Amino acid sequence: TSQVRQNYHQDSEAAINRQINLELYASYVYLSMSYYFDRDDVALKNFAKYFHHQSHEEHEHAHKLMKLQNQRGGRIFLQDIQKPDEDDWESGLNAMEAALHLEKNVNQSLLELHKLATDKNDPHLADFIETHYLNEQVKAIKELGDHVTNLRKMGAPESGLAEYLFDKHTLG
Amino acid sequence: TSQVRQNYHQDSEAAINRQINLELYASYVYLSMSYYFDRDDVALKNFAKYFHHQSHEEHEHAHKLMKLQNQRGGRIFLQDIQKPDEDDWESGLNAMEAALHLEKNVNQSLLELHKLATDKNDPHLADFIETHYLNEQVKAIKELGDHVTNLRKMGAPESGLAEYLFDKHTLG
Amino acid sequence: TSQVRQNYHQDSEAAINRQINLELYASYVYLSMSYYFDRDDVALKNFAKYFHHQSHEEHEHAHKLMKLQNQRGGRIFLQDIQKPDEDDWESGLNAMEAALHLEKNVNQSLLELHKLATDKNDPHLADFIETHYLNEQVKAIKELGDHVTNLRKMGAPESGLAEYLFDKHTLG
Amino acid sequence: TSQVRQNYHQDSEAAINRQINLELYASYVYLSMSYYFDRDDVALKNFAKYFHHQSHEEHEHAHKLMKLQNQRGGRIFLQDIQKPDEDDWESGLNAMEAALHLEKNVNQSLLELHKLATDKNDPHLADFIETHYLNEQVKAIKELGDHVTNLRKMGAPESGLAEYLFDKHTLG
Amino acid sequence: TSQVRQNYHQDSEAAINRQINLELYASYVYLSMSYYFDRDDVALKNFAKYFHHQSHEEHEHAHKLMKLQNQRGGRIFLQDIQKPDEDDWESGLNAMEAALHLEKNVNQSLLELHKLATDKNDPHLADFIETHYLNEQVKAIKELGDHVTNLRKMGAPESGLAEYLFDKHTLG
Amino acid sequence: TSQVRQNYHQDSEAAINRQINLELYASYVYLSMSYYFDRDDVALKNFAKYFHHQSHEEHEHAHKLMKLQNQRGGRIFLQDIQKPDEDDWESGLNAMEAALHLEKNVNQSLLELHKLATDKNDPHLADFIETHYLNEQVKAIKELGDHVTNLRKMGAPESGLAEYLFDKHTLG
Ligand SMILES: [Ca+2]
Ligand SMILES: [Ca+2]
Ligand SMILES: [Ca+2]
Ligand SMILES: [Ca+2]
Ligand SMILES: [Ca+2]
Ligand SMILES: [Ca+2]
Ligand SMILES: [Ca+2]
Ligand SMILES: [Ca+2]
Ligand SMILES: [Ca+2]
Ligand SMILES: [Ca+2]
Ligand SMILES: [Cu+2]
Ligand SMILES: [Cu+2]
Ligand SMILES: [Cu+2]
Ligand SMILES: [Cu+2]
Ligand SMILES: [Cu+2]
Ligand SMILES: [Cu+2]
Ligand SMILES: [Cu+2]
Ligand SMILES: [Cu+2]
Ligand SMILES: [Cu+2]
Ligand SMILES: [Cu+2]
Ligand SMILES: [Cu+2]
Ligand SMILES: [Cu+2]
Ligand SMILES: [Cu+2]
Ligand SMILES: [Cu+2]
Ligand SMILES: [Cu+2]
Ligand SMILES: [Cu+2]
Ligand SMILES: [Cu+2]
Ligand SMILES: [Cu+2]
Ligand SMILES: [Cu+2]
């Protein structure tokens, strides 16, 4: 047992390791999306930039969790970062919809993690999740929702003009 | 034989003279395109600006080759710069497609030149082509590809609105 | 076939996809190492900083390859990023030795990729590997070699004092 | 007929197209001269710089005419840019003499163009030629005359010392 | 075998040691030339400055090769730096001609080294030679060629006035 | 006999030529030492920097002597720069000890040169040696002595830790 370990349940330690992997997975999904929009037959550079930014945001999310694991005296056990479910993301709208779904999945995991922290009477871990993750999730979900709505109302994905104009006026 | 000449095959010297002409030809094509978009019945000033820039880029490509010829002790023999295949470039999309085709043709010539340099064991010439030309070609081809894709997806060439908006939002 | 694709063999495209994965793997190994030195029972913060820097360097290596894939009209196919071979990296010296081994493995892959590019007469790809990868590898390998030597001569890994002083005087 | 076309004779339109070609030809002659002085067995870098400058001056002359063609609702029809009459320009003095001859030929063409504009009662075209071309010609001819005189009086082309000193003291 | 050594043939290592010596020799030749022009009975201080600069350029060439040897895990074995073939360099023109000959000899050695690297499938070494040496050679050879031409055309070496004026107007 | 020559004995001229060679030799020894510490299996970069600095100091020593030779109307006759006595310098301490020995040898030569100048009643040469060389020698010898002492007292060469710490705290 670590010299720093105090009030840190083995279940919480395991849950943190799982969340680390999920954040790294989310980062990979966004990296995949970024380079899809970099394709010569897609060519939406601000979509590419947007998802690249999201990829690095997820990387920071993974960082804070790995730091937390060591702070609490838990031990980091990394797992494979699974390849994303798609190679071809179809369109700007589809990518935004897939991102929205991803963020709701990540949020669900974090809410489960918060419940576990509460159940194990770990207020430090509970507050860590609240302070650094829960509102970040809500903000991300709202933003992606907003983006999906605009694209749909503009005529995407059928209208290539819509996706082009959104790339220029919202993501640029 | 020039006092500076060393490891420079007569075939390479001839190939360099041909490439000089091709770069000057490419510059002329782009100049032609530039002024097509300057026409009162076309009036796409950022298309005009874009192709004008490309024309001067090609001029620099010709410069470096003429400099190389003299550096290696070869002798510059200029030929006619042939007029472009078209006087009327039809549309923004058609011009971009024609430019893409042109750049792939120029690239093919450079790849043949590189093969010749390799065959004649001329690593200086081989590296000159690699350093200053091959990636410039790849970058140009990718950019033009990106532009063609956007214009097509936006509804060009039938949509004059598409070409107008692309002129303003991508080339401006 | 992509509109931009020219002189780009399917074998090269596949090799590029494999290299993308290897660079992402290297980034993951370094991230793992970084947080090992962040442990309360290891506590070498400049080792942690050093490997974190290397992790982001590898991330950039992956970026340039993904960009290259799209530049040439190839298609990015991502695979799982495998977890590193170790969870516990033992010591500063062992981590440096493992990094050295990793870099020689990455270098071997790149040399094989260069040979393939040469065999397929793809001088653009050959020069891409030379310009952006081969010397970066040689520099990384030399640096890690230097670090291993210092640590060994100082008395690592048995001497915790040696690893502490190296952390402060070389990596700080 | 162009929506902008007014008082613009078809003969004038044709004459403008011919002048565009002549200006591009002059630019090519000067480019050829520039690189002749860049040869290792000539090596007069300020002669090279001087003619390069003249080449770009001619390029601007062609620009203004192409702009004029579109301004008036005429249509640009480009022709081959003929290679210069010489590959080897012999000496600094000979190049200056050839340039002088070229400029008098270009001037003759412009004076004929002005006469045509007057004959067709096109005062806009007449003034365009006067404002942007006629005095530019007179200035160029005088300058080249001055240069020829100096070189001759100094002992060129027999004196390589004369051409060297002129390169340094007048063109540098 | 060095811990860093990878894909580095013993023949290449030996060739690098030979090239190190040749670069140091070239530096010595230029140092000798520099001080010849410093003599009271020669007194061409800009010739002296020019060759001194070249001497330090060669010193840097030797540096990069010694660095390369260690980078690749080869071992530096230095040899005698042979005294130059002349003590008295006769004239500015003769020194420039001797320098031209020297640079073509150094270039020949580097081209042989490049061929060896290619034959041993060492693309890192091949690119090292291309990037840092081959064009530097071509540039040096062209410059010296230019200088020889000017001096000859001005009347050197018989004309002491020619050498004096060249010292002042080209090398100053 | 040079027009500038006055009170300059042929023996002094010869002695100066010998000293020029010795200073160049010293520069070569230090260059050799510098790159020994650049080896991946030595890796003491501040030792490398220190000896590199000393190498360029010796180069300046050679410069002043070559200048002196010409100032006095003597004639520079260069000889081979002999390779150093060692390829492998063993350790930081051994290199410092070898440098100390070298500097005492150079000093002995200069003291002999001073005696010759005195014997030939050449006060200019005597003062040249005093002003620019004798105290520089004493300073170099003292510094190297100081360095040897520190390394010995710290536990070098057996202690790799000692050499590492000296590299960081004295030479850095
Ligand atoms: Ca999987
Ligand atoms: Ca034709
Ligand atoms: Ca696995
Ligand atoms: Ca013709
Ligand atoms: Ca008027
Ligand atoms: Ca007027
Ligand atoms: Ca000898
Ligand atoms: Ca290359
Ligand atoms: Ca290269
Ligand atoms: Ca010897
Ligand atoms: Cu990134
Ligand atoms: Cu996240
Ligand atoms: Cu997220
Ligand atoms: Cu222009
Ligand atoms: Cu080009
Ligand atoms: Cu191009
Ligand atoms: Cu990071
Ligand atoms: Cu990498
Ligand atoms: Cu790496
Ligand atoms: Cu130009
Ligand atoms: Cu003109
Ligand atoms: Cu003109
Ligand atoms: Cu003057
Ligand atoms: Cu010097
Ligand atoms: Cu060199
Ligand atoms: Cu050189
Ligand atoms: Cu140096
Ligand atoms: Cu000295
Ligand atoms: Cu000394």
UniProtKB/Swiss-Prot annotation, chains A, B, C, D, E, F:
Provide this UniProt record's keywords sorted from A to Z. Acetylation, Cytoplasm, Cytoplasmic vesicle, Iron, Iron storage, Lysosome, Metal-binding, Neurodegeneration, Oxidoreductase, Phosphoprotein
GO BP terms: namely: immune response; intracellular iron ion homeostasis; iron ion transport; negative regulation of cell population proliferation; negative regulation of ferroptosis; negative regulation of fibroblast proliferation
Q: Where is the site Essential for association with cargo receptor NCOA4?
A: R18
**InterPro entries from the xrefs?**
Ferritin, Ferritin-like, Ferritin-like_diiron, Ferritin-like_SF, Ferritin_CS, Ferritin_DPS_dom
Task: Report the leader peptide range.
Answer: none
GO molecular function list: ferric iron binding; ferrous iron binding; ferroxidase activity; identical protein binding; iron ion binding; iron ion sequestering activity
| Catalytic reaction(s) noted | 4 Fe(2+) + O2 + 4 H(+) = 4 Fe(3+) + 2 H2O
Q: Name one GO cellular component term.
A: extracellular region
Q: Which Pfam families match?
A: Ferritin
Q: Where in the cell is it found?
A: Cytoplasm; Lysosome; Cytoplasmic vesicle, Autophagosome
**Tissue-specific expression:** Expressed in the liver.
Q: EC number(s)?
A: 1.16.3.1
- The record lists Fe cation 1 as bound by E23, E58, H61
Keyword GTP-binding in the entry? The reply is no
Give all residue intervals belonging to the Ferritin-like diiron domain. Answer: 6-155
Changing R18A has the effect of: Abrogates interaction with NCOA4. Fails to localize to punctate lysosomal structures
Residues forming coiled coils = none
**UniProt disease link:** Hemochromatosis 5: A disorder of iron metabolism characterized by iron overload. Excess iron is deposited in a variety of organs leading to their failure, and resulting in serious illnesses including cirrhosis, hepatomas, diabetes, cardiomyopathy, arthritis, and hypogonadotropic hypogonadism. Severe effects of the disease usually do not appear until after decades of progressive iron loading.
Task performed by this protein: Stores iron in a soluble, non-toxic, readily available form. Important for iron homeostasis. Has ferroxidase activity. Iron is taken up in the ferrous form and deposited as ferric hydroxides after oxidation. Also plays a role in delivery of iron to cells. Mediates iron uptake in capsule cells of the developing kidney. Delivery to lysosomes is mediated by the cargo receptor NCOA4 for autophagic degradation and release of iron.
Query: How does the annotation summarize its subunit structure?
Result: Oligomer of 24 subunits. There are two types of subunits: L (light) chain and H (heavy) chain. The major chain can be light or heavy, depending on the species and tissue type. In the human liver, the heavy chain is predominant. The functional molecule forms a roughly spherical shell with a diameter of 12 nm and contains a central cavity into which the insoluble mineral iron core is deposited. Interacts with NCOA4; NCOA4 promotes targeting of the iron-binding ferritin complex to autolysosomes following starvation or iron depletion.
Similarity-based family: Belongs to the ferritin family.
Q: Which PANTHER family match?
A: FERRITIN, FERRITIN HEAVY CHAIN
What name is this protein filed under? Ferritin heavy chain
Q: Which organism is it from?
A: Homo sapiens (Human)
Gene encoding this polypeptide? FTH1
